[PDB]
């Protein structure tokens, strides 16, 4: 056979490549644009913001507009990867606990619209655990539009213990824009949002102790970092560096009543059979671009520890390439001998119909 194609659809970015590679061949923005050709996808859809009405097909992880998603996939196949989908089995990723109806539309589009010889849909968080080389653990997947905690035991996810936190990279990006603005600068436009997203990714970090970090930055300049704008203006970022990602642990800074990532992780563990909570505590795996902040692991360690029984062994695993662990796990799974029997063949589709997805996929 040829290569399966691994397509990781995200809320902000989409990752695509060939099973067997250790990194996705292409990564582009999850946006489609039409007149305010007929449509535009990715970076070129943004540079035409003023003349195009932009839409975001994947919000908070769920596909909300199928015509748009279909265009993202068409763009992924012909423009990005430059392959014929009918000559490749396709593995798509999806968010945990998504509408059963969605899973059927994904299958249908892949077969009836792209004529894929075979496809499959897999929960992102599970792929990340596989990427870490485990079959048991609790993954904290945090991206650009949504965050989930997914307990997995012996290779299978535990639906009833999965939680969803609507706080991720996009919220943090805007929050950084707001505090720097309060600082004396002015970041409010979509063009500027792209700039603050870059600042956030390069100079932000999670303090081990908020207050102490605040005190150190209020009486010293030791934590300050300079950032240069394209036009040459140099701006300094002080406590914003850590105050921004702090919103993950304290959503209230954003007017949100939901509990932080550490507490949400703990809550997923408690929803699990007491017999496996230990395995989960010693195997808390970070995933997604938003778990990339320097210092986040040691902070998760300290916070989880404070929540769990004193006799509990805590361990936070923060893979270096966790910004793509989902896609990678997909690359790994698609090539698994034991996984081949899971693909949904076009034959299995013609006979059983779209509903075949609930049998082999879930």
Ligand X SMILES: Nc1ncnc2c1ncn2[C@@H]1O[C@H](COP(=O)(O)OP(=O)(O)OP(=O)(O)O)[C@@H](O)[C@H]1O
Ligand Y SMILES: C=C1[C@@H](C)[C@H]2[C@H](Cc3ccccc3)NC(=O)[C@]23[C@H](OC(C)=O)/C=C/[C@@](C)(O)C(=O)[C@@H](C)C/C=C/[C@H]3[C@@H]1O
| Interface ranges with ligand X (CB under 6 A) | 10-13, 61, 143-146, 168-170, 173, 197, 200-201, 204, 288-290, 292-293, 323
Choice from 7, 122, 167, 316 touching ligand Y (CB under 6 A): 122
> Closest-CB residue for Ca ion?
252
Asked if 338 touches ligand Y (CB under 6 A), the answer is yes
Q: Which is nearer to Ca ion, 24 or 143 (CB)?
A: 143
Q: Which is nearer to ligand Y, 318 or 333 (CB)?
A: 333
Distance between CA atoms of 133 and 303, rounded to whole angstroms?
25
The item of ligand Y, Ca ion, ligand X, none sharing an interface with residue 146, based on CB under 5 to 8 Å by kind, is: ligand X
Distance between CA atoms of 268 and 212, rounded to whole angstroms?
30
Choice from 252, 340, 347, 355 touching Ca ion (CB under 5 A): 252
Q: Which is nearer to ligand Y, 45 or 357 (CB)?
A: 357
Beta-bridge partner residues of 27: 15
Q: Which is nearer to ligand Y, 123 or 237 (CB)?
A: 123
Asked if 289 touches Ca ion (CB under 5 A), the answer is no
The item of Ca ion, ligand X, ligand Y, none sharing an interface with residue 252, based on CB under 5 to 8 Å by kind, is: Ca ion
- Classify 186 in phi/psi space as left (phi over 0), alpha (psi -120 to 50) or beta: beta
Choice from 33, 57, 85, 143 touching Ca ion (CB under 5 A): 143
Q: Which stretch binds ligand Y (CB under 6 A): 4-12, 64-72, 120-128, 174-182?
A: 120-128
Site for ligand Y in 156-175 (CB under 6 A): 156-157, 159
Q: Which is nearer to ligand X, 12 or 117 (CB)?
A: 12
> How deeply is 312 buried, as exposed, middle or buried, from its count of CB atoms within 10 A (0-12, 13-18, 19+)?
middle
Asked if 99 touches ligand Y (CB under 6 A), the answer is no
The item of ligand X, ligand Y, Ca ion, none sharing an interface with residue 344, based on CB under 5 to 8 Å by kind, is: none
Decide: 160 and 185 in contact? Cβ < 8 Å: no
Closest residue by Cα to residue 110 from 73, 158, 55, 161: 73
Q: Which is nearer to ligand Y, 16 or 122 (CB)?
A: 122
Burial 223-250 (b: 16+ CB within 10 A, else e): beeebeeeeeeebebbbbbbbbbbbbbe
Phi, psi of 9 (to 5 degrees): -85, 120
Output the CA angle 191-196-201, nearest 5 degrees.
Answer: 130
Distance between CA atoms of 77 and 268, rounded to whole angstroms?
37
Decide: 91 and 119 in contact? Cβ < 8 Å: yes
Residues contributing to the site for ligand Y (CB under 6 A): 122-123, 126, 155-157, 159, 338-339, 342, 362
């Amino acid at each position: 056979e040829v290569a399966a194609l691994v397509v990781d659809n995200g809320s902000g970015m989409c990752k695509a490549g060939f099973a067997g590679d250790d990194a996705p061949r292409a990564v582009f923005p999850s946006i489609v644009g039409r007149p305010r050709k007929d449509s535009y996808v990715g970076d070129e859809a943004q540079s035409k913001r003023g003349i195009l009405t932009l839409k975001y097909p994947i919000e908070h992880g769920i596909v909300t507009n199928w015509d748009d998603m279909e265009k993202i996939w068409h763009h992924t196949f012909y423009n990005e990867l430059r392959v014929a989908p009918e000559e490749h089995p396709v593995l798509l990723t999806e968010a945990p606990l998504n509408p059963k109806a969605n899973r059927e539309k994904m299958t249908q589009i892949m077969f009836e619209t792209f004529n894929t010889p075979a496809m499959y849909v897999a929960i992102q968080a599970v792929l990340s655990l596989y990427a870490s080389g485990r079959t048991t653990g609790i993954v904290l997947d945090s991206g650009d539009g949504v965050s989930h905690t997914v307990p997995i035991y012996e290779g299978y996810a535990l639906p009833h213990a999965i939680l969803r936190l609507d706080l991720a990279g996009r919220d943090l990006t805007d929050y950084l824009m707001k505090i720097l603005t309060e600082r004396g600068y002015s970041f409010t436009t979509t063009e500027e949002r792209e700039i603050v997203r870059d600042i956030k990714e390069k100079l932000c970090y999670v303090a081990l102790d908020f207050e102490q970090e605040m005190a150190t930055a209020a009486s010293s300049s030791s934590l300050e970092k300079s950032y240069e704008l394209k036009d040459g203006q140099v701006i300094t970022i002080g406590n914003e560096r850590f105050r921004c990602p702090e919103a993950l642990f304290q959503p209230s800074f954003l007017g949100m009543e939901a509990c932080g990532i550490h507490e949400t992780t703990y809550n997923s563990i408690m929803k699990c059979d007491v017999d496996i909570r230990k395995d989960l505590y010693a195997n808390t795996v970070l995933s997604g671009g938003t778990t990339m902040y320097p210092g986040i692991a040691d902070r998760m360690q300290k916070e989880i520890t404070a929540l769990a029984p004193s006799t509990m062994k805590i361990k936070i695993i923060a893979p270096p390439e966790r910004k793509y662990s989902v896609w990678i796990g997909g690359s790994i799974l698609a090539s698994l001998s034991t996984f081949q029997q899971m693909w949904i063949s076009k034959q299995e589709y013609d006979e059983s119909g779209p509903s075949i997805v609930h049998r082999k996929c879930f």
